[PDB]
Design a protein around this ligand. Structure first.
Ligand SMILES: CC(=O)N[C@@H]1[C@@H](O)[C@H](O[C@@H]2O[C@H](CO)[C@@H](O[C@@H]3O[C@H](CO)[C@@H](O)[C@H](O)[C@H]3NC(C)=O)[C@H](O)[C@H]2NC(C)=O)[C@@H](CO)O[C@H]1O
Ligand SMILES: CC(=O)N[C@@H]1[C@@H](O)[C@H](O[C@@H]2O[C@H](CO)[C@@H](O[C@@H]3O[C@H](CO)[C@@H](O)[C@H](O)[C@H]3NC(C)=O)[C@H](O)[C@H]2NC(C)=O)[C@@H](CO)O[C@H]1O
Ligand SMILES: CC(=O)N[C@@H]1[C@@H](O)[C@H](O[C@@H]2O[C@H](CO)[C@@H](O[C@@H]3O[C@H](CO)[C@@H](O)[C@H](O)[C@H]3NC(C)=O)[C@H](O)[C@H]2NC(C)=O)[C@@H](CO)O[C@H]1O
Ligand SMILES: CC(=O)N[C@@H]1[C@@H](O)[C@H](O[C@@H]2O[C@H](CO)[C@@H](O[C@@H]3O[C@H](CO)[C@@H](O)[C@H](O)[C@H]3NC(C)=O)[C@H](O)[C@H]2NC(C)=O)[C@@H](CO)O[C@H]1O
Lengths: 160, 158, 159, 159
């Protein structure tokens, strides 16, 4: 289904994401210039995340404008981050004034696409099905996307 | 392309909608119960609109929960509404949680679908291409959809 | 729902086309040059047809390479054709080597698209829902499309 | 892009399949009962294949109605096959009358779907991009699909 995902909020999916589910995060704007306001955290960070019932972040997708990179990671509920997996940020967005981040579920990894082009395969690290998604940003910053995202959960059979 | 359309706002399209353009208004909420607060207007009205460069509402689609109806109309810039064309509200959205209103452009009419099922063909009345879309509601009411809609502009296939 | 439609054959739809049904005839080839041989009819004609249960051709879409024009019409079963509605052929095909003719059903008219671009609205003339489709050509000619077409029936909500 | 693929033929793709290319083989018929005639091979085998420029079968997808299984493998041109990877046949088809086998390319593997539901991930074994596809059957048998398939080559951005 479709979900409205407001910046700084978590939305519950209607049901756990089934095998091979696809999640599309849609923004209507793209601003790759770093947030004019860095704020108290010292890290320009806007992220989307796939969460399980327990609250673990199965997949964290962070955009780092000041670091020229995407940061992928998994974060167990109430625990610290795992090791980061990073790819350069430049050359990913651009072709769409309305950028999208799509994740395709696979048995042991997530296929991550930017504007429907695959940029990374992230090996799963934590157990459980995705049941929630979030869109967060470090205190006092402005995101690279619209402050509201359209999130669509779909299956291959839905687009065929 | 994709647009975020907030309640009581107008969004400009990236370009004028071309012939046979398709505009999909997506909500992640459905609440067919009339707005608990009716407000000063006395009319429970939440609507989406297609507007030309000149500010004319080419097509107005109103949801009237208190009247069991959809109201379609066109409103010239700074003038009054045209005659209203209505159809029942019941049996359209049903209870699907993410309702959508899709408008498919034709040369002389708009095909209107609720949840991708065609409900009405509205004969065009005003000239000009759709260049902006809006989402409005009468003072003091709560809408039957989410307060933010995802609006997608597309053309059949690729 | 997908169907194989060979040249000079008719194929039953799995069920009649429902309101607002979309039928897409897909070819893997395009050749707008007239058929090398004209044959005995003297009319270079290849066509696809939407037919009801009683055999009536609800909508006939003919491609006339030598006449520079599509021909639209309806033919009751066992009777002669009605008045033809023509549009030029030039300017339709084709942004692609695998052309398609898509028909979108509407209560009173069909919307005809070439390569998903609308080229004409044809007012319905005969009663009944489309339950079969055909792909036909005049004796001794070769078509502008592949000798086999993929026909897909879909609805806006599939999409 | 669309292509007509006849049984016992090989069709060239428009260009080598790019990363994440999706290939959909569509049939307008489904018949899982074993081929009435088995033939001299003694193996009821109908298959589709993805082939590179050198003629190597990058991926072989075989339906074995008398063995209750799909057989996946890669076969270098003019060389014997490698080890087979199999999954049961039962429970994959049956939901629709027009079955399809989709292959979604990944860097080191092919994601295989039956009726758009993923059934297997086959690790790539041979080098080179897919440039041809084929549809074959053992001598004297009839296939579980129509004798002509619609083959669509697309990329996620196309849907
Ligand atoms: C102290 C130590 O052992 N080493 C320091 C590193 O931990 C530190 O790396 C940065 O750490 C922060 C906090 O973990 C990272 O930011 C977090 O990233 C995760 C996803 O990986 C995300 O969920 C959090 O939202 C985000 N935090 C905030 C507040 O934005 C950050 O990416 C790391 N940066 C790196 C590794 O380049 C570095 C800081 O440069 O210092 C070490 O001394
Ligand atoms: C002069 C006279 O006696 N006529 C009365 C009608 O005017 C009245 O119609 C109602 O008028 C209002 C105001 O136009 C309509 O509401 C508006 O609807 C348009 C779309 O058509 C929309 O753009 C506006 O947002 C909306 N305005 C508000 C404030 O919500 C309303 O739908 C009409 N209702 C009808 C026709 O039933 C009718 C009864 O209402 O009585 C006549 O006697
Ligand atoms: C009254 C009279 O006899 N006048 C002649 C016209 O009938 C004739 O028109 C042409 O008629 C032929 C045959 O009907 C048309 O081709 C047919 O087109 C229909 C669809 O409209 C198609 O289903 C048939 O397959 C097809 N027949 C064949 C054999 O291909 C043709 O389009 C008409 N051409 C016109 C009207 O320009 C004209 C033709 O010059 O001659 C009159 O004498
Ligand atoms: C040690 C030894 O001799 N091994 C024998 C195995 O080779 C044999 O396996 C069967 O082999 C046949 C022929 O190779 C297999 O069919 C082939 O399958 C490939 C794809 O894997 C396909 O491309 C070929 O078209 C196809 N050949 C024909 C003619 O259809 C078949 O799947 C194998 N069946 C098995 C292994 O279950 C087994 C068979 O019992 O015997 C060994 O002794």
């Amino acid at each position: 289904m479709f979900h409205i995902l407001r910046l700084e909020s978590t939305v519950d999916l209607s049901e756990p994401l089934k095998d091979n589910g696809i999640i599309v995060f849609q923004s209507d704007k793209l601003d790759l210039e770093p947030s004019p306001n860095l704020g108290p955290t010292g890290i320009d960070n806007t992220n989307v995340n796939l969460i399980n019932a327990k609250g673990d972040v199965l997949l964290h997708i962070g955009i780092r404008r000041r670091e020229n990179a995407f940061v992928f990671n998994s974060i167990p509920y109430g625990e610290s981050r795992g090791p980061e997996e990073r790819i350069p940020l430049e050359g990913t967005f651009g072709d769409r004034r309305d950028p999208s981040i799509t994740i395709f579920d696979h048995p042991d990894r997530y296929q991550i696409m930017i504007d429907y082009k695959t940029v990374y395969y992230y090996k799963k690290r934590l157990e459980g099905r995705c049941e929630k998604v979030s869109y967060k940003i470090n205190e006092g910053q402005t995101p690279p996307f619209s402050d509201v995202l359209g999130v669509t959960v779909l299956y291959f059979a839905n687009v065929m």
